[PDB]
Amino acid sequence: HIPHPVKYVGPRRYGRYVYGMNRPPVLRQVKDWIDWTGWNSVFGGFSFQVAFGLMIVSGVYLNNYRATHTLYY
Amino acid sequence: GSIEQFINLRTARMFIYGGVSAVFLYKATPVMYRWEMLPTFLVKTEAYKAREAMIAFDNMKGIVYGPYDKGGLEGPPTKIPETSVGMMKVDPM
Amino acid sequence: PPTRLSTPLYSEGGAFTVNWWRNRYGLYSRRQTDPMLAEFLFRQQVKEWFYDVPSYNYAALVGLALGILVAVIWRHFLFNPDVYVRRQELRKMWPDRHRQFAYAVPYLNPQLKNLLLPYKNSFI
Amino acid sequence: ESADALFVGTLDRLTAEHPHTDDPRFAFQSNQWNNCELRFTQFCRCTRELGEDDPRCKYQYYRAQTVCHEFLLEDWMEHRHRGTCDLDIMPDRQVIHMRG
Amino acid sequence: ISTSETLNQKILRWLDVTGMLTRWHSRREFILDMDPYFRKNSGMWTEWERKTLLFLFYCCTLATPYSAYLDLQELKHQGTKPPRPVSLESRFMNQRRYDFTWMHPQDKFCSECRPVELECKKMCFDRYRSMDYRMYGFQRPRIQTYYSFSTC
Amino acid sequence: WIYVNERQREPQENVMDHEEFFRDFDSIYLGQVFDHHRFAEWLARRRAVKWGYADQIHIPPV
Amino acid sequence: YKTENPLYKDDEPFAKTCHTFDYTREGTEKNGLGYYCLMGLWASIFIWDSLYTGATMPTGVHRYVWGPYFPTAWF
Amino acid sequence: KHFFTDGANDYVTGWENTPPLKFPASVMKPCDYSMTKPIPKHWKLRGSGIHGPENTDLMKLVLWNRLKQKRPQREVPNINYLKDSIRLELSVNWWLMSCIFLWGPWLHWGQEYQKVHEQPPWAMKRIDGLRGEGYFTWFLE
Amino acid sequence: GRRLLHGNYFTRYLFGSLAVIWIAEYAAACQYGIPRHRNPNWMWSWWLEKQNQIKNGEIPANTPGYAMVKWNNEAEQRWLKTLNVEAMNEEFARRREAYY
Amino acid sequence: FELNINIINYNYLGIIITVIISIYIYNNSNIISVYNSNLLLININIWMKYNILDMLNLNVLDYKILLWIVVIIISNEILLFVSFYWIYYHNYINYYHVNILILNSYNIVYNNIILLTLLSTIVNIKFYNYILSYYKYILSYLIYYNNYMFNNKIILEYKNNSNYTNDSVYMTSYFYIILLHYIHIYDSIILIVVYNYVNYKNINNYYININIYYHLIEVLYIVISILLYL
Amino acid sequence: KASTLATGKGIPGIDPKLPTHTPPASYDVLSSGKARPVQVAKWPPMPGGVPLPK
Ligand SMILES: CCCCCCCCCCCCCCCCCC(=O)OC[C@H](COP(=O)([O-])OCC(O)COP(=O)([O-])OC[C@@H](COC(=O)CCCCCCCCCCCCCCCCC)OC(=O)CCCCCCCCCCCCCCCCC)OC(=O)CCCCCCCCCCCCCCCCC
Ligand SMILES: CCCCCCCCCCCCCCCCCC(=O)OC[C@H](COP(=O)([O-])OCC(O)COP(=O)([O-])OC[C@@H](COC(=O)CCCCCCCCCCCCCCCCC)OC(=O)CCCCCCCCCCCCCCCCC)OC(=O)CCCCCCCCCCCCCCCCC
Ligand SMILES: CCCCCCCCCCCCCCCCCC(=O)OC[C@H](COP(=O)([O-])OCC(O)COP(=O)([O-])OC[C@@H](COC(=O)CCCCCCCCCCCCCCCCC)OC(=O)CCCCCCCCCCCCCCCCC)OC(=O)CCCCCCCCCCCCCCCCC
Ligand SMILES: CCCCCCCCCCCCCCCCCC(=O)OC[C@H](COP(=O)([O-])OCC(O)COP(=O)([O-])OC[C@@H](COC(=O)CCCCCCCCCCCCCCCCC)OC(=O)CCCCCCCCCCCCCCCCC)OC(=O)CCCCCCCCCCCCCCCCC
Ligand SMILES: CCCCCCCC/C=C/CCCCCCCC(=O)OC[C@H](COP(=O)(O)OCCN)OC(=O)CCCCCCC/C=C/CCCCCCCC
Ligand SMILES: CCCCCCCC/C=C\CCCCCCCC(=O)OC[C@H](COP(=O)(O)OCCN)OC(=O)CCCCCCC/C=C/CCCCCCCC
Ligand SMILES: CCCCCCCC/C=C\CCCCCCCC(=O)OC[C@H](COP(=O)(O)OCCN)OC(=O)CCCCCCC/C=C/CCCCCCCC
Ligand SMILES: CCCCCCCCCCCCCCCC(=O)OC[C@H](COP(=O)(O)O)OC(=O)CCCCCCCCCCCCCCC
């Protein structure tokens, strides 16, 4: 373990919830939440499915389309 | 000069963004149709109709009473066993 | 091997070093309860095992055996015609497995077989 | 009439002219079970195209006998005659690609 | 309709009908929703831990309906599984050295049928019934029973 | 309860004739995905014919 | 007075003693550029093998501007 | 962390080999007397000399490890520690999201295409007359 | 807080191992010169010719493979007695008209 | 002072449990086996009672000893699955060209993966609450619903499958590998039914054991899914 | 903060007194004293900055 600072640089408090007034845009809020809880969990969790999905769906071009246009017989 | 008045940055982000979107849909929609990506209820592809036209629900043949077909000229049994006749508890009609 | 805790132990950088070993040696230890005692026990183990000259001979042997073990396992999967991992050829009858048959002849003629077969006359 | 004619055309020809020698596809292994299955499948396909009476398919059966023990062939030939030999099932009636 | 609130406030209110959003945005509301015994330990929680716990909890519960939908579709698929061709008994298919009796070592019901071969057992139970020996199952039409997942 | 509830029902028609299946492969193999309601009704009628209680039951129309 | 929110404070260092823990020179904390290069190569080999099926069976005709013993010929 | 380790992740007893960095060295310090200057010859050994509680630092380490177990408030860790504590939980949750929103859509698309064209969209169409879906994972063919 | 394994060990040794396996396999193929083009079809030449004839329309559609061979097993002889390709085609034609 | 360890002098469960095992061999009726299994369950519970009572000794090494025992047990479970994978892949050369219908790669795999992932998320939330000294009643009932669906799906799949154990070594290995996973799912039900809040918290070996075991079952299914369905 | 060279005195960005960039400030009158002319464009600029004849 190497000690290191906290990388979160977004706002630390939005203030008291008052019927959802004076709060950031929703997309900005989603970005802040993932910054707060760590992008490392997002990348690790999504990595496996992204790798599998890309490999399978790439065959639409690599295996199906190219093969039809590239058969020397 | 008479058209300069109609350029107002909203018209430039409604023509430029609206124009690129139109090209994207114009060029992408045929591809989605070909690859069966469009919703079925919205439209059915010709390939979809060709397959569906081959489907019927009135075939009552091939009923067999054995797990295996052991070859030969007789094939799997096709007659219900006598002991199994009238063994179903059917609610009154 | 120093005998005084004041004298530091030289360590290199990397994944297998004195510092790397110190960090992990006492993770599961109930006996290393303070710095002085922890260092004493750490140096005791390092002195007993890593400064023992004959121990390095066994390190060489495990490396050689494992190296051969990994190579033979990998070679079977990569080159052996009879070993199947992909399924394209297994979905066809035997006469149609053209791609698999490509492994047969080259796998039948490894270099060492050619070198050593001529030495049969030392036995017969 | 060429020195390498055996290899040319097919790998099959190699053991057709030298029935009692190793087949190039299975020479690496002592176990010849897969060799027997390939030979039998070849005999099954010959009859479909040429018919049993053809001398070619008669020799293909002999090639199978060169590597297949008789107790195997008798059982497999029985399945072929009935129509349950998985080797001889016609391609359009295979189920290998069904349900996955 | 109510015009005393914005459209966003109205949408948030209804999504909060069970109080989930209110508990998320109020520490006091969250701790008071705990039972008294566990509220004793709530003071030690950081806001990071509290909201992170709710995020994991809400994602799990919100995903449960989706899994239920998949399971229901799976049950419907199995409930109306299309028939498949009868298997040709190949060279190494359907080999038996002895009858199937490991389920019933002493009774030896359906010795010829395999442990989960339902159609074989049905005809075998019918023989036993015809011999004045009761057996349970395979008598009610699938469309006349509940939980069949085979109704039109 | 799951086992007991299912055991009461007649078994589904697991298999059919080998040749008849292939002569109507598209309908049988793909019938479920295209129209599951009609396909389910078709299965019920076959089960009624198979076990000889078709005349004793009224299969709802689809 | 002035205070720091504990949530955003830095990690405490290992104590400096006779028995000091140090991971600074190990280089095991995170995957490095070499790992991401291996991933890039794996993607390239995966795409390349599918795109160009005849790559494994290359042509035997050899044509060199400066012959076969010139460095550019070797690669 | 989930797994218990006597050295680092000792949550069963809470023992720590060294005191907190908050305390001044005068108040409490790590138990290290490796740098002790040579003892004068005229000094005489009164105690055992055995490593143990006679040494002040070890006594204070034992005392603190027992008396630290009651504290008025929580000692709040930084967000880095809190992230690490539930790293597996957060990652499994994101994996569930990926299955629902990435795998599900393209798996559904493949089945629909397979219905119309007899084979998945990522497979070469056959010309050999065999019927059925065929393989799914094309790159393992 | 002390670490025993690589900071990203799980992803490192899973994706890393898969990458090394894939790259090693490509190297092995190059050394042995194995063809890497994928064929999803059976290679029986006579059968492929018959399938092409069906596609060209020379052979009536939905004609079984056993209807085209020179040797039939017992099970196929059973099926040939009930085979009516002409009737099957008419039934399919009727279905298309109803659908459209 | 006191002895480092409070010795256990006598025990009689060992005789009872061993005799219960023998009754399985010497049965003349399968009904006796069913009732014998209940006795085994009862006596194993008594042994678990002794472990809880040992807390009175206040021995720091007791937690560590039991934790490492579980690690060894986990390894044995993994190696048992390895043998089944070994059996499956030995006959790999005989698969995929025999006239049997192998399982689809679209329906069963996806819902099971989704279903088992939810099970992991529930257990993860239990661990988080255990860290925070907190409890949520609904969590246990989510597991029961999860286990109910898994049982319902697997039962139907076996009954509607058109191939049998005697058809091919492929089918035998498919059924056996899936059953072995189910048995480990059922063992999880045996463990999770007693989940409660205990006020001595992080010195309770049960919580760490359950988290490790549930994770093992789920990861094993990923390997099974890749081998058989995909 | 930026009190000594070690703390960052004289380093743009770190030192408060020195800005990261020194862009010229806008003006409303030319140095001659003429008012700065204003031109509101409605079409993109010429490809090469070519001026049109008066
Ligand atoms: C391709 C796509 C598909 C992929 C499919 C993949 C399938 C995988 C199947 C896996 C099945 C599930 C198994 C794990 C279930 C539990 C999961 C869990 O809870 O994880 C989170 C959790 C994370 O822990 P944490 O403390 O929160 O860590 C926080 C951070 O991660 C940071 O933590 P940290 O780094 O600071 O370290 C703390 C933590 C770090 O540890 C972990 O977190 C462990 C994570 C493991 C996850 C699984 C990854 C795969 C591992 C493969 C190992 C292969 C072994 C070699 C095989 C050789 C074959 C020839 O330490 C521990 O927890 C210690 C645990 C005790 C380890 C005991 C090991 C005994 C065996 C030693 C080797 C024996 C051979 C010696 C040979 C040489 C002789 C000279 O893990 C645990 O706590 C699990 C520990 C308890 C279970 C251990 C099981 C050990 C089994 C040993 C088998 C030995 C067999 C030897 C013979 C074999 C050949 C004959
Ligand atoms: C002119 C022509 C132009 C042509 C242009 C062509 C363009 C082509 C584009 C190609 C692009 C290629 C890109 C390559 C470079 C990639 C660079 C990169 O980012 O690499 C690293 C990147 C990520 O690695 P990383 O940086 O280490 O990750 C950072 C982490 O945050 C590290 O942080 P961490 O370690 O803290 O992470 C969190 C970690 C923290 O760990 C812990 O908390 C400690 C405990 C760990 C041990 C856990 C033990 C077990 C846990 C139990 C719980 C299980 C829950 C689930 C239960 C399921 C039950 C069913 O925990 C976890 O991650 C594990 C727990 C989460 C749940 C695990 C779920 C199970 C996983 C195992 C099974 C996986 C297989 C599933 C298969 C499906 C289902 C069967 O790697 C990849 O993404 C892999 C590369 C894939 C390459 C594919 C190439 C082929 C495809 C090409 C597609 C395009 C072709 C199109 C055609 C073109 C024709 C021309
Ligand atoms: C105008 C009204 C509009 C209503 C719209 C419908 C909304 C229905 C929502 C149902 C959500 C169920 C989620 C189940 C997972 C477990 C949830 C949980 O953790 O509960 C903890 C909660 C409290 O646990 P605790 O341990 O005391 O506290 C733990 C926390 O500290 C504190 O826990 P917490 O307070 O944070 O809990 C947060 C939340 C966490 O969960 C969620 O937020 C998940 C939300 C998922 C939404 C699912 C919507 C499904 C709707 C599908 C409709 C499809 C229609 C198709 C049409 C086809 C046309 C052809 O949990 C709940 O709020 C669960 C529901 C509570 C209701 C309990 C009373 C009995 C059921 C009443 C149902 C009334 C329905 C009225 C419909 C009227 C429509 C005009 O547990 C209970 O209350 C006890 C057990 C009962 C809960 C489950 C009740 C299931 C009711 C299902 C109703 C919908 C059926 C749709 C059938 C469609 C067939 C086609
Ligand atoms: C699907 C997704 C698609 C995503 C789309 C995303 C779109 C994003 C937004 C796009 C917005 C574009 C417009 C914004 C305004 C322009 C930008 C601007 O002013 O920036 C400031 C920028 C610089 O500002 P400044 O620094 O303040 O000005 C100082 C200087 O006075 C001026 O600065 P300077 O002195 O530096 O010079 C400016 C510039 C001069 O400006 C340009 O060069 C502009 C070029 C525009 C080209 C557009 C047409 C070509 C593309 C056609 C695509 C067809 C697609 C067909 C699809 C079919 C589908 C079925 O010169 C250079 O930068 C020097 C370039 C040197 C390299 C040249 C290399 C040439 C190599 C050729 C080799 C060929 C060899 C083979 C022979 C081939 C023979 C054919 O201003 C300029 O660049 C001024 C000129 C602007 C001209 C804009 C022309 C727009 C044309 C639109 C045509 C639409 C037709 C629609 C047809 C019907 C539709 C249904
Ligand atoms: C100014 C520019 C604006 C641009 C806006 C772009 C909008 C793009 C919107 C894209 C929407 C795509 C929706 C795809 C949903 C597919 C759902 C689906 O297939 O559901 C079925 C499947 C389960 O079905 P089964 O029968 O079980 O089969 C699979 C397992 N056996 O369920 C799921 O897939 C559930 C997951 C739902 C995924 C939803 C994806 C939504 C994507 C939204 C993208 C929005 C982009 C916005 C961009 C804005 C830029 C300014
Ligand atoms: C066991 C089968 C399981 C199938 C699982 C399917 C999912 C695939 C992904 C996970 C498994 C990893 C394998 C991926 C392979 C990808 C490339 C591929 O298809 O390779 C096929 C290729 C061979 O297939 P065929 O062409 O049919 O045979 C030709 C003649 N033999 O397979 C291989 O060579 C790779 C298979 C082995 C991979 C595992 C690594 C092998 C070495 C193990 C060494 C073990 C000893 C100890 C090592 C210590 C290391 C620190
Ligand atoms: C209050 C009552 C509650 C009941 C419900 C809840 C509790 C449930 C407990 C867990 C049940 C787990 C059951 C595990 C065995 C499942 C058996 C099974 O399915 O076997 C069949 C399945 C597939 O077979 P086919 O029918 O050919 O498949 C074709 C598909 N149509 O696999 C097998 O055949 C293998 C069978 C292995 C059974 C092993 C179980 C242990 C049996 C031991 C008997 C020993 C008897 C000798 C005396 C010693 C007594 C200990
Ligand atoms: C017991 C069986 C276990 C399972 C089987 C495992 C077998 C394989 C295991 C390998 C080790 C896995 C972990 C690897 C971790 C890792 O990535 O480790 C990453 C390291 C770099 O480390 P850092 O980046 O962390 O410092 O990479 C390496 O040391 C090697 C990989 C980098 C890329 C190598 C390039 C190879 C070139 C090949 C020729 C290409 C030709 C192209 C022509 C155009």
Which residues have a Cβ under 8 Å from the Cβ of A50 and sit 6 or more positions away? H98, H102
Cα distances (Å, whole numbers) of residue J137 to C39, C84, E7, I6: 48, 50, 35, 37
Which amino acid makes up residue G36?
Y
Query: Structure tokens of J14?
Result: 């060992």
Q: Could you tell me which chains touch chain K, where touching means 3 or more CB pairs under 8 A?
A: B
Strands (E), chain E: 84-85, 87-88
DSSP secondary structure letter of residue E17 = T
Q: How remote is the C-alpha of E121 from its chain's centroid?
A: 26
Cβ atoms C19, G25 nearer than 8 A: yes
From residue H37, alpha-carbon distances to G17, H33, H40 in Å are 17, 9, 9
Please indicate whether residue K51, judged by its CB atom, sits closer than 6 Å to ligand 4.
no
Among the listed residues C112, A47, G42, A60, the one whose alpha carbon sits nearest the alpha carbon of residue I25: G42
| Crossing angle (nearest 10°) for helices A39-59 and H87-98 | 30
Structure tokens at A20: 């959802």
The closest ligand to the CA of E32 turns out to be 3
DSSP, collapsed to helix, strand or coil, labels residue H136 as coil
List the one residue out of B60, I92, E146 whose CA is nearest residue F41: B60
What are the tokens at J207? 């919580």
Contact, J111 vs E71, CB < 8 A?
A: yes
Distance of CA J120 to the CA centre of its chain: 14
Residue keyed to tokens 């439209």: B43
Could you tell me the CA-to-CA distances from F30 to A46, C20, I64, J20, J99 in Å, in that order? Answer: 34, 61, 20, 53, 20
Give me the residues of D, 29-88, that contact B with CB < 8 A.
79, 81-84
| Torsion angle (degrees, nearest 10) of CA J21, J23, J26, J30 | -110
Tell me H11's DSSP state.
T
What's the first-to-final CA gap in chain G, in angstroms?
70
Give the span between the Cα atoms of H34 and J92, in whole angstroms.
Answer: 63
Q: What is the Å distance from ligand 5's center to H102 Cα?
A: 9
Cβ-defined contact of E140 to B69 (cutoff 8 Å)? no
Kind and range of the H or E element at E88? strand E87-88
Decide: F13 and E83 in contact? Cβ < 8 Å: yes
Which chain D residue has its CA at the smallest distance from H119's CA? D97
Angle of CA points H86, H87, H92, to nearest 5°: 100
Q: Are D42 and C95 in contact (CB under 8 A)?
A: yes
- Residue F9, beta-bridge partner list: E140
Which residues fall within 8 angstroms of residue C105, CB to CB, at 6 or more apart?
D24
Number of alpha carbons in the 13 Å side-chain half-sphere of residue E60: 25
From chain H, pick out residues whose CB is under 8 angstroms from the CB of F30: 115
Q: Which of J93, J97, J101 sits opposite D99 (nearest CB)?
A: J101
Distance from CA of J57 to the nearest CA of E (A): 27
Phi, psi of F40, rounded to the nearest 5 degrees: -65, -45
CA–centroid distance, residue J141 to ligand 3 (Å): 14
* Torsion angles phi and psi, residue K35, rounded to 5: -65, 140
Q: Is there a contact between G55 and G49 (Cβ–Cβ < 8 Å)?
A: yes
> Helix D33-50 to helix D55-67 angle, to the nearest 10 degrees?
170
Shortest CA distance from D94: residue in chain H: H130
Question: Tokens at residue E123, please?
Answer: 């005809």
| H abuts I (3+ Cβ pairs < 8 Å) | yes
Asked if residues H5 and C25 have their Cβ atoms less than 8 Å apart, the reply is no
- The answer to whether residues H30 and G17 touch, using CB atoms and an 8 Å cutoff, is yes
Number of helices and strands in chain C (H, E): 6, 0
CA distance I89 to D90: 21
Instruction: For chain A, give the longest Cα–Cα distance.
Output: 71
- How was this structure obtained? cryo-EM
Resolution of the structure, angstroms? 2.2
Pull the structure tokens for residue D31.
């176990």
| Nearest residue of I to residue A72, measured between CA atoms | I37
Would you call G53 and I30 a contact, using CB atoms and an 8 Å cutoff? no
Is there a contact between B61 and F17 (Cβ–Cβ < 8 Å)? yes
Name residues 125-164 of chain J within 8 A of C (Cβ): none
CA dihedral E140, E144, E146, E147 (to 10 degrees): 80
How far is residue D23's CA from residue I31's CA, in Å, rounded to a whole number? 23
Indicate left, alpha or beta for J96 from its phi (over 0: left) and psi (-120 to 50: alpha).
left
